[PDB]
Design a protein around this ligand. Structure first.
Ligand SMILES: N[C@H]1[C@H](O)[C@@H](Sc2ccccc2)[C@@H]2OC[C@H]1O2
Length: 330
């Protein structure tokens, strides 16, 4: 089997991407944030505290003839940005772009943090990291991909995120028309439960390539590119007037600037992030200070190849017995 679904930026900055997902019988369609950096499928629901729902579409398990309460199961997750949610668990039928999983754990939120409440466009998350990170207790549950894998034509999914435009998540096949040149595959460590890999280096604009190992995770649920402070300083040094602002929370730059590209290495291959992918616009409405899309990972504890990086590539998440990651230009 295969599945194919369009993923769409939630706003003009590509702050996140949402993908329609069918849950239950009859189908209830929710727009979920596909997150290769976590492993819970959770949704706003009829059980979510009323004051914490503001415009989201909710899952109502009582209206689904295939929903079953997973007795005694609860979940609670806290994300790297400080966001959180928690609740109980149903199993139900879940379909993505024509690919159907029966008995998928659908984690129903009773509580969500303010950041989720304030995001009216995101109805929940669909985790695509390794199932070892799933937070359901006392019986850990599998991700949608984990459940689908054996049925897929090939045990893979691909992320093709657009810049200020829609893109595609495919399951079970590699669309050879969706990228240019070849896909370069690179080793993955699953030891921390992430799609963790090691970039071979970087370049800033037309500068020389610096060969250096950068361990990080491929994370579709993180907006920006978080890299070591040395690398990030080298990038913003090429932007006149750019500086790190403790009050704003990272590097900012004059909105009148032209940003240089940023290249990262995948083995001997190179992925080029165009400069305008690194512009996240005024720090507040009407400001001439703009927020940068490349930020320091100091304090996070891990480097993160988020959407700023991934949207410059066609990315293969290869879930074979020894997982790997593939990157192609597009
Ligand atoms: N793996 C990522 C996860 O999806 C988000 S949770 C989130 C919060 C608000 C809006 C959308 C998503 C959090 O920030 C980056 C990292 O942890």
């Amino acid at each position: 089997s295969t599945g194919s679904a369009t993923t769409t930026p939630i706003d003009s900055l590509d702050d996140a991407y949402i993908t329609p997902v069918q849950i239950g019988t009859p189908a209830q369609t929710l727009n979920l944030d596909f997150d290769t950096g976590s492993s819970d499928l959770w949704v706003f629901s009829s059980e979510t505290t009323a004051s914490e729902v503001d415009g989201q579409t909710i899952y109502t398990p009582s209206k689904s003839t295939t929903a079953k309460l997973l007795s005694g199961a609860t979940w609670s997750i806290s994300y790297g940005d400080g966001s959180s949610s928690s609740g109980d668990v149903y199993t139900d039928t879940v379909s993505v772009g024509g690919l159907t999983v029966t008995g998928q754990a659908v984690e129903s939120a009773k509580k969500v943090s303010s950041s989720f409440t304030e995001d009216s466009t995101i109805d929940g998350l669909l985790g695509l990291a390794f199932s070892t990170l799933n937070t359901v207790s006392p019986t850990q549950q599998k991700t949608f991909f984990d459940n689908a894998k054996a049925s897929l034509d090939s045990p893979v999914f691909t992320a093709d995120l657009g810049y200020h435009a829609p893109g595609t998540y495919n399951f079970g096949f590699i669309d050879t028309t969706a990228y240019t040149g070849s896909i370069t595959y690179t080793a993955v460590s699953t030891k921390q439960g992430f799609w963790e890999w090691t970039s071979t280096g970087y370049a800033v604009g037309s500068g020389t390539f610096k060969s250096t190992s950068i361990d990080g995770i491929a994370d579709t649920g993180t907006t920006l590119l978080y890299l070591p402070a040395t690398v990030v300083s080298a990038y913003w040094a090429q932007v006149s007037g750019a500086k790190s602002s403790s009050s704003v929370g990272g590097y900012v730059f004059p909105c009148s600037a032209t940003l240089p590209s940023f290249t990262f290495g995948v083995g001997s291959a190179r992925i080029v992030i165009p400069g305008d992918y690194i512009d996240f616009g005024p720090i507040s409405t009407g400001s001439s200070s703009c927020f940068g899309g490349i930020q320091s990972s100091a304090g996070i504890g891990i480097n993160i190849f988020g959407d700023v990086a991934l949207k410059a590539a066609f990315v293969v998440f290869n879930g074979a017995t020894t997982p790997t990651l593939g990157f192609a230009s597009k």
